[PDB]
Paper text:
However, when the pH decreases below 7, TELSAM forms a six-subunit-per-turn helical polymer that can enable fused target proteins to co-crystallize. TELSAM reduces the entropic cost of crystal nucleation and growth by pre-freezing some degrees of freedom in the crystal lattice. Additionally, pre-ordering many thousands of copies of the target protein along the polymer results in substantial avidity to strengthen the subsequent target protein–target protein interactions that are formed when adjacent TELSAM polymers associate.
No twinning, pseudo-translation or TELSAM-polymer flipping was detected in diffraction data sets from these [name] tag-free constructs. Specifically, the side chain of Gln138 in the vWa domain forms van der Waals contact with the side chains of Ile110 and Asn114 in the adjacent vWa domain. Pro144 in the vWa domain also interacts weakly with Asn107 in the adjacent vWa domain. The effect on crystallization of removing or retaining the purification tag was then tested. It was discovered that increasing the linker bulk and retaining the 10×His purification tag improved the diffraction resolution, likely by decreasing the number of possible vWa-domain orientations in the crystal. In the constructs reported here, retaining the 10×His tag during crystallization clearly did not block crystal formation and may have improved the crystal order by limiting the possible binding modes of the target protein to its host TELSAM polymer. While the inclusion of a noncleavable 10×His tag appears to have blocked the vWa-domain binding mode associated with TELSAM-polymer flipping in the current case, we expect that polymer flipping may be dependent on the specific size, shape and preferred binding mode of the target protein.
Residue numbers in the entry: 12 to 252, 254 to 267
Write the structure that this text describes.
């Protein structure tokens, strides 16, 4: 096992350009390597993972081979397996904004591609349905995104039913013995006692150890979403575009 600094324990695909430079500095001291110019790998972690070992050797004649192998060992290190459950409003009210919801999910799916990530897509209006059962298969995730794009919104906003399906999957996955995240996308416009249903189901989610995020669409009800999510800090606007980097970092910081 490699004992990395705490702030470098994230999977390297998430490393910034500054993280790469910090990794080099750490490796130099840890392995008594010859000094590494700080811009020897001027790129982020996604880019670093595309280089070949030959590329490492050319960039660092004195240490490139060791650095490449160190990266391979780091990639092999055990990390927190995250299950991400997207619970998506497809009620009639979002008929003209289904595109925002789909593309938001697509952008997060394209980010969370490290092998330890598994994704599930749930939609809800009057009833909830699993479009994509929890999986890490990037192929199945591609098809689930194809299916999501085709959804025709209609019906009520029974978000408690969508959360219920996420919780049922979580329970089957191990409950407290998992690292589960729920990402609910909705305007938060809940009728009748649905606010009570939804808040009860979300506390079940947390009872199972999951962390709940709410992503607001349209003129969304900020207060209602704060009561469903773990905290105000886990409510994000889909219109934030920065909002994507915010929720990604928040999720990665749960590990
Ligand atoms: Cl960067
Ligand atoms: Cl060198
Ligand atoms: Cl699978
Ligand atoms: K994908």
């Amino acid at each position: 096992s490699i004992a990395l600094p705490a702030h470098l324990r994230l999977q390297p695909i998430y490393w910034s350009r500054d993280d790469v430079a910090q990794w080099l500095k750490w490796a130099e001291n840890e392995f008594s390597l010859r000094p590494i110019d700080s811009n020897t790998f001027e790129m982020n972690g996604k880019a670093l993972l595309l280089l070949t070992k030959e590329d490492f050797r050319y960039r660092s004649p004195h240490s490139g081979d060791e650095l490449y192998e160190l990266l391979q060992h780091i990639l092999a290190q055990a990390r927190t397996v995250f299950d991400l459950y997207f619970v998506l409003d497809k009620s009639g009210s979002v008929a003209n904004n289904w595109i925002e919801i789909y593309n938001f999910v697509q952008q997060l799916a394209e980010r969370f591609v490290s092998p330890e990530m598994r994704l599930s897509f749930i939609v809800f209006s009057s009833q909830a349905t699993i479009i994509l059962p929890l999986t890490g298969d990037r192929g199945k995730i591609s098809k689930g995104l194809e299916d999501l794009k085709r959804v025709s919104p209609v019906g009520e906003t029974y978000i408690h039913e969508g959360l219920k399906l996420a919780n049922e999957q979580i329970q089957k996955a191990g409950g407290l013995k998992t690292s589960s995240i729920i990402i609910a996308l909705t305007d938060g416009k809940l009728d009748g006692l649905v606010p009570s249903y939804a808040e009860k189901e979300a506390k079940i989610s947390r009872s199972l150890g999951a962390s709940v995020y709410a992503v607001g669409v349209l003129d969304f009800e900020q207060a209602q979403l704060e009561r469903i999510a773990d905290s105000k800090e886990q409510v994000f606007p889909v219109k934030g575009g920065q909002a994507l980097k915010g929720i990604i970092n928040s999720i990665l910081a749960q590990s």
